[PDB]
What we know:
Two copies of one chain form a homodimer.
Chain A: H1 2-16, H2 22-30, E1 51-54, E2 57-59, H3 62-71, E3 79-83, H4 89-98, E4 103-108, H5 111-123, E5 129-133, E6 146-151, H6 160-164, E7 166-176, E8 181-189, E9 192-201
Parallel strand pairs in A: 3-4, 3-6, 4-5, 6-7
Antiparallel strand pairs in A: 1-2, 7-8, 8-9
Helix pairs in contact in A: 2-4
Amino acid sequence: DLEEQKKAVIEKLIREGYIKSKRVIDALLKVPREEFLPEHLKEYAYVDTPLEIGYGQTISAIHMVGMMCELLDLKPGMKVLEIGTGCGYHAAVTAEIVGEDGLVVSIERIPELAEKAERTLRKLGYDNVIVIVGDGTLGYEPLAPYDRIYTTAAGPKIPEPLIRQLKDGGKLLMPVGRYLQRLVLAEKRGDEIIIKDCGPVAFVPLVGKEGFQ
Amino acid sequence: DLEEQKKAVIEKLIREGYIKSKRVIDALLKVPREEFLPEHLKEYAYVDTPLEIGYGQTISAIHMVGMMCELLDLKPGMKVLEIGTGCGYHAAVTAEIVGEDGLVVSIERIPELAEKAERTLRKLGYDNVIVIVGDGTLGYEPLAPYDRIYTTAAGPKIPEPLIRQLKDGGKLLMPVGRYLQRLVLAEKRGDEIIIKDCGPVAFVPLVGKEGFQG
């Protein structure tokens, strides 16, 4: 059953070093992942694997969500930009970590996906997440600058808009790769960006003006 | 199918509790939202979600337009001030609710956007909607006191020009805050305003002399 599988997968993530922070651990224990899945996939809510959720988009594996949350070095009260809402799950886990005084802005290219994610987030009480349909490779200037930015889809490059929209000291985490893809963490300092390679990954293409055709 | 989607989303909004008034429900059923949208988005006209449309504009979900129409407590015959025309869809919805003997004055900062909104409204017969290019944080003195006032963009405060231009007993609905925003409903009574919190929202910023500075 779900609650046992959930617990099992969370202790696994801790043991293996995927997650280590209390807020990340608690966020993953609280968010009901099943609520974000189509009926027929709900029974697989705590199988640590990606799932197709429609329109050729996926919810990421739980270990990837957890690891991304850790790498992103989030804090209560932050304003975060998520590129790629999908089913809304990762946006909800981000919202738990930043808490009620924080804000998550989330851009989704597929209108039908954004509408469903918005309903799930409403239903569950996530009143600090705003999902907007648009081309996420341009970020979202009306609410910028952001403390933290991440994408759940891989671009052939880091879009310039995402860097420009980052606060000084801000950090951006995204998979990048026209072919094979690496998870990159970029930190803004002054007129420099520090980029760290965080390992090979494989996410669905980020499509837009500053991403894939 | 667009027609099916239209009926389906309005019925969704009734059941979610966003809309309940016959005049609001009828206005949402009537205005052809697709006319106001760029060609590639027309097919999405009845998908309920904020949507980036162009020119740094994000239009509100249909549910937010409905809920705002309800909160604003409109009646046939009212004179209404809208700050932030956008593509002109919300102004058309307002125009339906106040009806042919009401008026909507709508202020838009961006001239190209204002001109397209005016032409869509005029093409469709919304001829008691005036689109004016200008700084909406200053309201619109020439057309007097308004029964109702609202904005489609968040400011740091309710601008004093909007309060001055409101009839006694009038209501103003607008988002207040920069990033963390509240939708507030203000009623004027004498030398007072009564302000009610209507929940969190996240509109684009309202920029101008009595709003967010450049």
